[PDB]
Symmetry: D3
Subunit: 117 residues, 6 copies
């Protein structure tokens, strides 16, 4: 509707195979503003937050069905995943649980903000 | 020689034109391990730290001569910059000042670490 | 069926974000012959005409549903548009109105022609 | 289920238009192990064999419906074919006829094998 | 220095092999404003005009030395040409003969103009 | 001068990181005819033979200086290698030793041949 946020993350298997550039770029080219980032340490992981109108449903469509075997080429699991264990990434589930996800990972100051062009 | 670090950053004009995916990927494909990331707010900026043997001279070669007019296609300023004012990025200058740069921006815990494959 | 023509165009928002290369190439790689081009001046716009068997339905499938929110990644609105106001391009609607569109924009001589390989 | 094989091949029209790199890479990036290759001489052709869990249905989804006019952008016929005569490639049909196809083209020794990472 | 123009063109062999998308995009991504286009009919050809500070020397560096055998990968002849007969394109020679080239091909009205972002 | 051959090969580290598509395509896009292929089994390896006028010096320029630290972005070692141990590939050394290399690996029949377009 306006200025809604959502939460993506990159599982240990993505990071390890060299995919962090690829994911980030697909979000840039759609039009969505990036607003916080960091890494953390099984294996390591990358956390982010993306802002624009509908970022919630759009994200889910970019990623592809959660069971690789069901997803479509053109999407991220469609071009790179094979099983549900090793499925490369997680994206925020609903315009509610965006918050329980964000607020549980990102302290107040970390989130920046600015106007685009 | 081994396990040396260096410091890249993405200027406000890069970020604004949608280049953060592109830069990150060129580092992934050469072989170098990524080890910390964050954003900050003129305009916003992205900070990183990359680890492997020679990451210092390699980085400089990936970016291209500081005066766009002098740099070569195939590199980052060669494919995307036109003048020295608006030149997209900064990369660490020497195996010394890597530190004065890192330590001045990144607190102890932020830097992670792990073994690759 | 044979040697049918159609009419694509690039809205002011496409042109402004730097997409004219991208669109043109997707038509080249499918197999379709290009046969006229020009630019014009809100904002500026790019006009074209493409020839082969079925170019009409194929074009529509390459572009994606007119409401970005409905279209699929892999297509042009799927990878780059977010709302219906700012939806990047227009493609010819039917094997009839191809003409009312062409003939209304392109004078007799402008249309070239040649044999391929 | 485990360690199943399948058989892809590249028709004379693919080879002639310069597509052998493109096809091979789409298989590499999904995760599947390559295990034999060769060429042969109408026109010439390229034969291969790919191994992992489900390689059979996955292959078919990567290629797209056999009638170009029916297939979806993001897939190989979706991005490059126009008619059913000149449709670029053939991929193995079922977990049975994988064999009648393989064994009819590839002598015992040609098939290699190794462990991945 | 400011707002200088230059003249690129695409030879019959480029056009025929499917390169018009590729060339145009390399100019878009550097930063230069596009300002007129058309096609014409041996074989057909594509004409253009590009505007920004230094577009003259930059163009020449993007294309590569005129003798393919001498040019460097990363540039247009470096990635696609083999001999000097069949060398894909022509780019304007000097900030003078930009004019004798432009004015000899493009009537007054065809050249548009606009402000960017 | 005409119809000279040369010999490329892909080391175990290339194959393992998923590069066989990438290499092959760079040869396709320059213009050179492919004429034999196979695989073999430390680790496995891929062998090939490429034909056109000057394929010998061109190949060497596409690959980059043998010491990664010396080579230039835009080339294959420039974009992907870091040390001389793990340097991804080998390409034929001179218009003589093309033969001692070819003939030592490829039996008479394996080499095909055909006319292009």
């Amino acid at each position: 509707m306006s200025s809604e946020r959502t939460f993506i993350a990159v599982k240990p298997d993505g990071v390890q195979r060299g995919l962090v550039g690829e994911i980030i770029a697909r979000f840039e080219r759609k039009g969505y503003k990036l607003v916080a980032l960091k890494i953390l340490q099984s294996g390591p992981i990358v956390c982010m937050v993306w802002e624009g109108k509908n970022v919630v449903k759009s994200g889910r469509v970019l990623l592809g069905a959660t069971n690789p075997a069901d997803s479509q080429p053109g999407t991220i699991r469609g071009d790179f995943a094979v099983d549900v264990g090793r499925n490369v990434c997680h994206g925020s589930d609903s315009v509610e649980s965006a918050e329980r996800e964000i607020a549980f990972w990102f302290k107040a100051d970390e989130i920046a903000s600015w106007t685009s062009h």
